[PDB]
Structures are given as structure tokens and as C-alpha cells.
Design an enzyme around this catalytic site. Sequence first.
Site, short mmCIF file in Angstrom:
data_model
loop_
_atom_site.label_atom_id
_atom_site.label_comp_id
_atom_site.label_asym_id
_atom_site.label_seq_id
_atom_site.Cartn_x
_atom_site.Cartn_y
_atom_site.Cartn_z
N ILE A 8 4.10 -17.57 -1.10
CA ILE A 8 2.83 -17.80 -1.80
C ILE A 8 3.05 -18.01 -3.30
O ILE A 8 2.78 -19.10 -3.82
CB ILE A 8 1.88 -16.60 -1.58
CG1 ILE A 8 1.46 -16.53 -0.10
CG2 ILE A 8 0.64 -16.70 -2.46
CD1 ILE A 8 1.08 -15.13 0.35
N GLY A 9 3.53 -16.97 -3.98
CA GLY A 9 3.71 -16.97 -5.44
C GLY A 9 5.16 -16.77 -5.83
O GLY A 9 5.89 -16.02 -5.18
N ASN A 10 5.58 -17.44 -6.91
CA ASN A 10 6.96 -17.38 -7.39
C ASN A 10 7.10 -17.89 -8.83
O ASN A 10 6.79 -17.17 -9.78
CB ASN A 10 7.89 -18.20 -6.48
CG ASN A 10 7.51 -19.64 -6.36
OD1 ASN A 10 6.34 -20.01 -6.51
ND2 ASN A 10 8.49 -20.49 -6.08
N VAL A 11 9.04 -12.50 -5.63
CA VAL A 11 8.61 -13.50 -4.63
C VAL A 11 7.74 -12.89 -3.53
O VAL A 11 8.19 -12.00 -2.81
CB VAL A 11 9.83 -14.18 -3.96
CG1 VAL A 11 9.45 -15.26 -3.04
CG2 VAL A 11 10.80 -14.66 -5.06
N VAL A 12 6.50 -13.37 -3.42
CA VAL A 12 5.55 -12.87 -2.41
C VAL A 12 5.48 -13.86 -1.26
O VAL A 12 5.43 -15.07 -1.49
CB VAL A 12 4.13 -12.69 -2.99
CG1 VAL A 12 3.20 -12.02 -1.97
CG2 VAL A 12 4.17 -11.86 -4.26
N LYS A 21 6.18 -8.36 -0.62
CA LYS A 21 6.76 -8.68 -1.92
C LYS A 21 8.23 -8.28 -1.92
O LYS A 21 8.56 -7.11 -1.74
CB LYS A 21 6.03 -7.95 -3.06
CG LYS A 21 6.12 -8.69 -4.40
CD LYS A 21 6.32 -7.80 -5.61
CE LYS A 21 6.37 -8.64 -6.88
NZ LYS A 21 6.84 -7.90 -8.06
N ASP A 118 -3.18 -6.64 -19.45
CA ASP A 118 -2.79 -7.94 -18.89
C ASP A 118 -3.83 -8.50 -17.90
O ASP A 118 -3.49 -9.28 -17.02
CB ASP A 118 -1.40 -7.84 -18.24
CG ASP A 118 -0.75 -9.20 -17.98
OD1 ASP A 118 -1.17 -10.18 -18.63
OD2 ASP A 118 0.17 -9.30 -17.12
C1 G92 Z 1 -2.45 -15.56 -1.17
O1 G92 Z 1 -2.36 -14.99 -2.49
C2 G92 Z 1 -1.85 -13.74 -2.74
C3 G92 Z 1 -2.13 -12.66 -1.93
C4 G92 Z 1 -1.61 -11.39 -2.23
N1 G92 Z 1 -1.88 -10.34 -1.44
C5 G92 Z 1 -1.40 -9.15 -1.74
N2 G92 Z 1 -0.65 -8.92 -2.80
C6 G92 Z 1 -0.30 -9.88 -3.64
C7 G92 Z 1 0.55 -9.50 -4.83
C8 G92 Z 1 -0.44 -8.95 -5.86
C9 G92 Z 1 0.27 -8.44 -7.12
N3 G92 Z 1 1.38 -7.54 -6.75
C10 G92 Z 1 1.47 -6.27 -7.24
O2 G92 Z 1 0.63 -5.82 -8.00
C11 G92 Z 1 2.61 -5.41 -6.88
C12 G92 Z 1 2.47 -4.35 -5.99
C13 G92 Z 1 3.56 -3.58 -5.67
C14 G92 Z 1 4.80 -3.85 -6.24
O3 G92 Z 1 5.87 -3.10 -5.90
C15 G92 Z 1 6.38 -2.15 -6.80
F1 G92 Z 1 6.64 -2.71 -8.05
F2 G92 Z 1 5.47 -1.11 -6.91
F3 G92 Z 1 7.58 -1.69 -6.27
C16 G92 Z 1 4.94 -4.92 -7.12
C17 G92 Z 1 3.85 -5.69 -7.45
C18 G92 Z 1 2.36 -8.13 -5.81
C19 G92 Z 1 1.57 -8.40 -4.53
C20 G92 Z 1 -0.79 -11.20 -3.40
C21 G92 Z 1 -0.52 -12.34 -4.21
C22 G92 Z 1 -1.05 -13.58 -3.89
O4 G92 Z 1 -0.83 -14.69 -4.66
C23 G92 Z 1 0.12 -14.73 -5.74
#
Ligand code: G92
Length: 327
Positions: A8-10, A11-12, A21, A118
Site C-alpha cells: 500500500i504505502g512506501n 512498508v505496509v 507493517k 505531525d
Molecule cells: C490502505 O491504506 C492504509 C491502510 C492502513 N491500515 C492500517 N494501518 C496503516 C498504517 C497506519 C500508520 N501506521 C502506524 O501508525 C504504525 C503502527 C504501529 C507501528 O509499529 C511500531 F512502530 F509500533 F512498532 C508502526 C507504525 C502504520 C500502519 C495503514 C496505512 C494505509 O496507507 C498508507
Amino acid sequence: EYEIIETIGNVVSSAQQVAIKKIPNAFDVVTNAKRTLRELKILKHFKHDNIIAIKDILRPVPYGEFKSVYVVLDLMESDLHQIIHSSQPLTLEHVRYFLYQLLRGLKYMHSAQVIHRDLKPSNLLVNENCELKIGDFGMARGLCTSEHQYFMTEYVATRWYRAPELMLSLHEYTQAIDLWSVGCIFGEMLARRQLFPGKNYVHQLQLIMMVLGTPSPAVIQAVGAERVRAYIQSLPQPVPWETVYPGADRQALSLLGRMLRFEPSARISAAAALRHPFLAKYHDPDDEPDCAPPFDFAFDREALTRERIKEAIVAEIEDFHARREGI
Ligand SMILES: COc1cc2ncnc(C3CCN(C(=O)c4ccc(OC(F)(F)F)cc4)CC3)c2cc1OC
């Protein structure tokens, strides 16, 4: 356990559907590892419908070869950026409901002494059923700080949403930072275009001044870097929000006006924003909790080697599983 489908995003990546993620090479760089530990502890401390939640953390191979962290979350259809800038509907009532939920999430967050720093539409996720969730907490900090970011506040977070105190280094860094960002987000929903799209530091100050007017002398004296003061003084009143957003609602601009102010102390709080007549429709104090106890950022100020942070992160994974699976 899980099966991947598309990145999806960029790694998710998408993968009962979930979002997964990858935090690759999580322990190879001090900054990245510290941010991963901060996010873990923040997200475990919060339990709230308008804040992103970790569903699962995939466990550790032997310990020395543990390089990547996988994090499972519920999949969110879209984000508020993709919604704002598209052929989707975004009526006033959409704007009203999305603003309520952001502010509901902030009241809880701000009560725990946590400043997001942010907030932008792209960090506000929205699922199929219209629940908005605040994500991406890597920039968040408390009221006390130790970092290059102690100075250089004008590089904190994203330029189009950054509060004047950070830009100008006004030495008053509070939860009011987020209410500026909310103001910009709120304004952006009303017009479906960014309010202050600055190209660089100087143009970003221009565009804010072209709406808010010249800042006060007391604000100007609190700018430490003399070179910025000279630019402000070289320029020759506020533009009413009515003429910025011609067809907009009256109750909305009232609330917006209480957010977009130069002085941090002049800004309405998240709690007080939720009492505004524009959000009367959704406002219920009994359903809008504070967060107790508050979040302590002491762990972040410690100067740890990558291997100690690694151990810290692994302990947060162990504790995550022990609190549900074990107990
Ligand atoms: C189709 O679109 C999308 C659906 C999505 N659904 C669900 N989550 C996401 C992302 C949201 C942002 N995010 C975090 O806030 C996060 C959470 C835990 C983490 O782990 C650690 F650091 F605690 F270890 C790190 C980062 C990462 C997940 C999604 C992101 C999307 O698009 C970019």
C-alpha cells in the site's frame, strides 16, 4: 497465520483482512530504533476508538538474527488526504463528523501529556464505516524534551501544517501545536485544498501572514534567530475568514478562527473545541474520555546503544503478548 496480497504505502501491505507493517532492519540505526520503541509504547498506552491500535505483533528465529518487526493492524479503507482530494462526497456534515473524531482523539491524547506534532490528512486514517484514527506517532513528544530537534524546531514535522512556534522557535511548545495543525486540516476540508502550501521556509511565513496579518511585537521579540526578525519587519491586518472561505458555514469559521492564532496560549484546546456550537451535534462529555495515567517520555531521553534499544523493543513485544495471551 497470515497471507499477503498487495503493498500500500512506501512498508505496509494488505493481507479476516488486516494491514501488516514491516519495520525492516529495525535495530540497524539509532534514530529508527528509538522511533520504533516510542511508537510501541505510545500505542500500547492508548486505548481509544480514534487512535490506531496494534492488533498483533509477530514474534521472533534466534535472538541475534531478529532483524525485522512485523506489526498487524486492522485495515483502514483510506485516509483523509485521499478523501479530501478526490471525487468523493465531502459535505459540511462530513467535515463536522471528521473534525469531532480528530478532536475526540486529541482530548484523550493531550490529557496524557502527549503532543502529536505531525497531524495531517494523510496521518488520519478512515475505515469503511467512517471511524477516523490518528496514526503515525514517530514525531510525538511530551512537554519536557532532552536531540538535534531540541534546537531546529523549524524542522519538526511537515511544513504545510507546522505551527508558528516551531517555525519561529518561540520557546513555548505545548499541545497547542496540534490545534494549529487541526486548523489547517479543518480549513483544508472546507475548501478541498491546502490552506498554506508553502514552497520553502520564507514562503510559508508569507502565506500565513497573507491571512493572519503581521504578528505582534511581543511574538517578534521572542524570535531568537535575528535573520528571521529582519524579514518580518521589512514587510509593510488579518483577512477575515469569511473572505478566505466565501461559501463556508458560519459556525465552522468561528471554531477555525479560535485555532489559527500565532500565540499558542490564544488557541482553544481540544476539550474546549468539543464544546463549540459547531460540534454540538456529536458532543457528549460522558463518551469523550481523558487518558489516565499520563505518558512518560523519560525512556526516550536515555542515550542507548542500538542493542539496548533492541532489548527494550523485544521486551515491549513480550509484554504485549503476556498481557493478552498469557494473562
Ligand atoms: C490502505 O491504506 C492504509 C491502510 C492502513 N491500515 C492500517 N494501518 C496503516 C498504517 C497506519 C500508520 N501506521 C502506524 O501508525 C504504525 C503502527 C504501529 C507501528 O509499529 C511500531 F512502530 F509500533 F512498532 C508502526 C507504525 C502504520 C500502519 C495503514 C496505512 C494505509 O496507507 C498508507
